[PDB]
Every structure is written in C-alpha cells, then in structure tokens.
C-alpha cells in the first residue's frame, strides 16, 4: 500500500522539524504531494467527517464564517459530512454547501461554566462516534468554531491519529510548555518530559482513535473533578498528556492553525487556517 516516500519529502523544508523519533511526519508546506494522495484516497472511496460545537449568545457569527470557509477549503474532491452541535437551533445559520458535502445538526444541553462546556465536548463526541459516526466516515476531525480556513486543508492531513502544533510554542523549550504541573492531576507531566505542545483547537484520526482520545481525556477530567482540581488548560492539558502516552501518527505544522498576532515569520509559508480573535 502507501509508504511515506510515496507522498512526503522532509528534505524540502530543512529549516524546521519534519520527522519525530517515533517515525511520524510533521506536515509543512512544500513536503507533501497532494495529487498522489487524492488519487490514492479517491480509489479507496473515503468520506471525511468534521465536528464543531457552537454554544452561546454570539456564536451564529462564528459558525457562519467557519462553515463558509470549510465548504470552500476542507477536503475538496472527497465527500464530507459536517456534524454541528448547538444549544439552540435558532443560532444555526443557513450556509449553502457544495457537491458531496452535507450536514447533521444536534441539540445539546449547555453547561453552566465555560470550562465544563469546553470539557464536556469530549463525552458528546464519543457518544456520537458510537451511535453513528463510526459507520459514516473513514476519518474524523474535531475543531473549535472560532477559526477560519484560508487555503486548501486536504488529504495530506489524514492519519490514524492527528495532532496540531500550537503556533505560540512550536520553537519553545519543553520546560516552558504550559502543561499541567501538579502531581495530583491526571494530566501531570514532569519538567524535562514532553515532545511538543499540541493545540486542542484541531485533532483527528480514525473514528476508533478519536473515540480513544476523547474517552481517555474525559476519564481524566472526571478523576480530577472528584479530587476537586481543574487542570490549568482544561481539556487541552489532558490532550497533551494523552498524546505524550499515545504518540500521534501524524503532526500538522503551525501553518495549519496560525495566529497572525504573532506576525508572519519565514517558517510560515502558506497559511491553511487562522485563529479568530479570542
């Protein structure tokens, strides 16, 4: 079947990290051959899923820009299903979708604290994987709503388990990473340990691996709540502990989730998705 050499050439980007000690690629602009992968996956007849949560008074605005840009740029050439989780179907806008795209919308019960809202996403995603997503798609991404696609985000991003490098920390020393540092938390990581600081705004994989990501994260959130502690960065702290223990089979460069408030240095060649103001 497919080997890394068929589509990935790390030597095209010599000035950045392109490979990990556990053999996973870090996908940067210039390293990938999308045409080879489009042909490969079209012969396999894949479908890709994308989950997004939109809760609160002013979300409808973020959802419109997210979905308009996703329709334009996410996995063009392949079927896609958008899964939209909302607290009031009023705030679901009408976005016209293109060929081979469709959507499903679900009402969720909103939580009181903005921290548990963010965290309880992990339970809901897993529930929907078991009930239907496992039977509908071959790969699944889970994304925050307050970001916008800017250029092609395609099949070069697919894999068994997929993590995103956080734009502010990708060149930093691991002792400076904002991991959870209390031994009492299920998310604890000691100083001198860790590979990268991953962003919780994008993660993905097969439905099987995304179920394992979300349920292990949710178990850690519950264990902490029962010991009356909340991790420094909530679900993202648990996500970073998960990916230290269960290494991702693919990593995306900060070009795939860029914050323009940093600027635009030479490492950032073509931006596929950008932060909204938070």
Question: At 94, phi and psi to the nearest 5?
Answer: -85, 110
Whether residue 256 is annotated as binding a ligand: the answer is no
d(CA 220, CA 218): 5
Catalytically annotated residues? 236
Q: What is the dihedral of CA 185, 186, 191, 193, to 10 degrees?
A: -170
Residues of 39-49 as b/e, b for ≥16 C-beta within 10 angstroms? eebeeeebebb
Whether residue 178 is annotated as binding a ligand: the answer is yes
Question: At 25, phi and psi to the nearest 5?
Answer: -75, 150
d(CA 179, CA 240): 7
**125 burial class (0-12, 13-18, 19+ CB within 10 angstroms)?**
buried
Whether residue 54 is annotated as binding a ligand: the answer is yes
Q: Please state the three-class secondary structure of the chain as a single string.
A: CCCHHHHECHHHCCCCCCECCCCCEEECCCCECHHHHHHHHHHHCCCEEEEEEECCCCHHHHHHHHHHHHHHHECCCCCEEEEEEECCHHHCCCCCCCCCEEEEEEECCCCCCHHHHHHHHHHHHHHHHHHHHHHHCCEEEEECCCEEECCCECHHHCCCEEEEECCCCCCCCHHHCCCCCCCCCCCCCCCCCCCCCEEEEEEEECHHHHHHHHHHHHHHHHHHHHCCCCCCCCHHHHHHHHHHHCCCCEEECHHHCECHHHCCCCCCCCCCEEECCC
Tell which residue, 260, 266, 249, 273, has the closest CA to residue 22.
Answer: 249
In terms of DSSP bridges, do strands 198-205 and 250-252 run parallel, antiparallel, or are they unpaired? unpaired
Whether residue 22 is annotated as binding a ligand: the answer is no
d(CA 16, CA 267): 7
- Under CATH, domain 1-278 is a member of which superfamily? Spore Coat Polysaccharide Biosynthesis Protein SpsA; Chain A (3.90.550.10)
Whether residue 45 is annotated as binding a ligand: the answer is no
The domain limits of the chain are 1-278
Whether residue 58 is annotated as binding a ligand: the answer is yes
């Amino acid at each position: 079947k497919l080997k890394l050499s068929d589509w990935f050439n790390p030597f095209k980007r010599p000035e950045v990290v392109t490979m990990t000690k556990w053999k996973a690629p870090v996908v940067w602009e210039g390293t990938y051959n999308r045409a080879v992968l489009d042909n490969y996956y079209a012969k396999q007849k894949i479908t890709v899923g994308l989950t997004v949560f939109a809760v609160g008074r002013y979300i409808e605005h973020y959802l419109e820009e997210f979905l308009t840009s996703a329709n334009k740029h996410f996995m063009v050439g392949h079927p896609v299903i958008f899964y939209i989780m909302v607290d009031d179907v009023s705030r679901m806008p009408l976005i016209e979708l293109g060929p081979l795209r469709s959507f499903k919308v679900f009402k969720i019960k909103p939580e009181k604290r903005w921290q548990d809202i963010s965290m309880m996403r992990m339970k809901t995603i897993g529930e929907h994987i078991v009930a239907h997503i496992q039977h509908e798609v071959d790969f699944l991404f889970c994304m925050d709503v307050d970001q916008v696609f800017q250029d092609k985000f395609g099949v070069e991003t697919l894999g068994e388990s997929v993590a995103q490098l956080q734009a502010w920390w990708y060149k930093a020393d691991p002792n400076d990473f904002t991991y959870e540092r209390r031994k009492e938390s299920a998310a604890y990581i000691p100083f001198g340990e860790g590979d990268f600081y991953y962003h919780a705004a994008i993660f993905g994989g097969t439905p099987t691996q995304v179920l394992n990501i979300t349920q292990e994260c949710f178990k850690g959130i519950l264990k902490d709540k029962k010991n009356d502690i909340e991790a420094q960065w909530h679900d993202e702290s648990h996500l970073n502990k998960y990916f230290l223990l269960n290494k991702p089979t693919k990593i995306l460069s900060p070009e795939y989730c860029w914050d323009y408030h940093i600027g635009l240095p030479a490492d950032i060649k073509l931006v596929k998705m950008s932060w909204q103001t938070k």
